[PDB]
Enzyme design. Structure first.
Site: not given
Lengths: 198, 198, 198, 198
Positions: C83, C90, C156
DNA sequence: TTTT
DNA sequence: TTTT
DNA sequence: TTTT
C-alpha cells in the site's frame, strides 16, 4: 583413501580456577551418573575416573551429533580417545573429511565450540589457554589444516596405555576388540611395525 | 614484441582470521559449485581443491571482463596460473600491454581492486598483508612497472608442477595442450633450454 | 478459526539518505528487471512503479521461504499487500499462526530481519525509524501480539484502491479474482457490509 | 504522457564570497567568450549578461551530455530557462523521465553534481546554501520526486519575461519561435488560459 | 584555458 | 548480480 | 534439554 582430522579437546579438572561461578545443578547431574565396565574388557576399577569420563562422553556425543547434523551424513567414521596428561586432560578425535572442505572448517569449528559452550557450560567461557583449538602442518604464517592418514593411529594412540589411556570409542570393524583390550592393541602395533619394516 | 605485466593475486584460506564477519550466503554459493576434469588432462582428483579454484576462476573472469571493458578490446591475450604456496595461495597473470601505458596503470589497478572488493567481498577489505599489489623492477625509490618478455614463462611457470600447480588458463595457440598436460610442458621446457643454449 | 499476524514492512525510496554507501550492483540488478501485467487485471501502466514492486515481491518471497523453512510447513496461508503511503511505502502481511506461538515469535522475527539484512542489504542496517517492527494490542507495558481475525481484511485492505494499492498477492480460493480487479473487491466489501449489518 | 523533472541550478555571482581561491585561468577563459543575438529575436543588448549566460549554457550542455551518456538515449527532450532572481541566479530544467525511475535518481544527481564540480570548478565545492538540490512534493518525511506535467510551463516559465528571463533553450517543435520572442509566449499563454477556462 |  |  |  580419504583423510582424517585431529581436533584436541581439553577437559577441565577444577572448580575454583577453571569454571568461575559454576552452578550446583551441573555438578549434581554430573556426579549422579555412574558407569560400569563390560565383561570383555581389561581395565581397572581405580585407574578410571567417573566425572571426567562422564563429561568426555557427553562432549564427544554432542560433537558427533553436531557433525551428523551439519554434514547431513549419519554414516561418519570417528575414533575418540581420552588420554591422560600431566597438565590437563586431553581427548583426540579422528573425524573423516567427507563433505567438509578446509576453508569452511574454521567457521564450522567455531560454531561447534559456541554450541558446546552454550550447551555444556550454559554460556560460560572457560579461562583455559587454547582449550578448543586445532592443529596445523607447522609452516610459517597461514598454514593449512593437518591431515591424518592411516599410519598415525598405531604410532600415537595405540601404544598409549594405562594410566594414560582412559577410554577409546571406535567405529571401525577391525578395532572393535582393540578398544579396551591391551592384547589386541599390542598385536595391531606389532603388525604395523612388521608392515612398515619392509 | 609487446610486453606483458605480472600481477599477483592472493587467495585467502581462512574464515576466522582472514574474512571477519563473512556472511553465510557467500560460502553457501561457493561450496555449492562443483567442477569436473577434462578427459584430455593429467591431474589428480585429490590434489586439486574446490572452493579455492572456484573463487580463483571467478576472480580471473572478473579481472578479464574488467580489462576488456576498460581497454575496449576483447582480443586480449592472458595466461593465468594458480600456484600453491607455503604461506598463502598465489595466482599469476600475463596480461598484454596493448592500450594501457604505465603511469595510468596505478589508477586502473586501484579501480580493479575496488571493483573486486565490492563484487566478490561485497565491500569488505581483507586484513591480508599486501594481498593486491604489483611488482616493480627493484630499484631505489619510485621504480617503474616490471615488464614480462617471452623468456619468463618457461622458466617460472612451466616447471611449476604438482602439487604447486593447480590450474592454468591459457589463450595462446601453442599452449592449448600445455595447460594441464605435464608432457607438453616438459617438452616446451626442453625446447626453450635447447634454444637458449646456443 | 486460527488467527493471523500483522507485520508491516517499510520499503525505502532514496539512496542519499536511506541507504548510505550502496554498491552499483544492487541498483544495476534492480533496474534490469521489468514486469508486465496480466490480461485478467484492471490497473494502469503509469500508476504502478517498477523498482518498489520488484523489491517488495523479492522481500515477500524471501519472507515466505523463511517462514516455510522455520515452521516446516509449505501449506501456509498468506496475503501480502503493498500500500502506497505519504511518508514511506508500507506493505502488510497476513500470516497464519499455525505452529508458532507468541513468545517465540520475537526471536523468529529478529532472525528473519537479520537474514533479510544480510541477504538483501548484505550486512547493511538502514537508518529508517522502526522500519522492521510488529504491532501490539495497545495496552500499557508489555502488550501481547495483535491477532487478526476474519473481519479485518475487507475493512482495511480491500477498500484501499488506486493510487494507494500497488500489488496484492493472495493465496485463498475466494480471493483469486479480487487481487487486481476492483469490481470483485467492491462486491466483497458490499457483501461484508451486508453481512455485518444484521 | 511521460512526466518531467524540475532541477534548479544556482549560478554564483561573486569571487570573494562564493568561490574562495579561484585561479585566473577560469576568469580569463570566461571573459574571452562573447555571444551575439539572432536576428529573429526580441531582446536587449544591455539587459542580457555575458558571464552568467556563458557559464549557464556550458552547465546545461554538460548536464545534457551526462544525461545522454547515462540514459543511453540521445533523443531526450529538454527545456532549460535561466531566470533572474533577487538573491541568486536560478536556472530551471524540464528533463523527461524516460529510462530513469525515481529511486536511482538520487545517485545519478549526486554523480552529476560531482562531475560538474570536478570539471567546472576542478574539484572545488562552493559555499552556496543548497545550490544543487531537487524539489519534492512537499509532504512530511521522505517525500517523493516532484513530477512536472504539461500544465506547468505556461504558468511558471512563459509569463516570466524581462528582466527576469535571460535565455530559454527549447527542443520541442511548437516552442521554436517562443524561445526569445515575447509575442509567441503571450499567444501561448492566452491559448493555455482559454483552454483551461472550459 | 574546455565543443582542439 | 539472487528463483543459475 | 529438566519429573532420565
Amino acid at each position: 583413501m580419504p583423510g582424517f582430522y585431529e581436533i584436541v579437546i581439553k577437559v577441565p579438572s577444577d572448580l575454583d580456577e577453571h569454571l568461575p561461578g559454576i552452578s550446583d545443578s551441573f555438578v549434581n547431574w554430573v556426579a549422579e551418573k555412574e558407569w560400569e565396565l563390560p565383561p570383555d574388557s581389561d581395565m581397572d576399577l581405580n585407574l578410571i575416573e567417573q566425572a571426567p569420563l562422564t563429561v568426555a562422553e557427553k562432549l564427544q556425543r554432542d560433537f558427533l551429533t553436531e557433525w551428523r547434523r551439519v554434514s547431513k551424513a549419519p554414516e561418519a567414521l570417528f575414533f575418540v580417545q581420552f588420554e591422560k596428561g600431566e597438565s590437563y586432560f586431553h581427548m583426540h578425535v579422528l573425524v573423516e573429511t567427507t563433505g567438509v572442505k578446509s576453508m569452511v572448517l574454521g567457521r564450522f569449528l567455531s560454531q561447534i565450540r559456541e554450541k558446546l559452550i552454550q550447551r555444556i557450560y550454559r554460556g560460560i567461557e572457560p579461562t583455559l589457554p587454547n582449550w578448543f583449538a586445532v592443529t596445523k602442518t607447522r609452516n610459517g604464517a597461514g598454514g593449512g589444516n593437518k591431515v591424518v592418514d592411516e599410519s598415525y593411529i598405531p604410532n600415537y594412540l595405540l601404544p598409549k596405555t594405562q594410566p594414560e589411556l582412559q577410554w577409546a570409542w571406535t567405529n571401525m570393524e577391525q578395532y572393535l576388540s582393540a578398544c579396551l583390550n591391551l592384547t589386541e592393541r599390542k598385536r595391531l602395533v606389532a603388525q604395523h611395525l612388521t608392515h612398515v619394516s619392509q
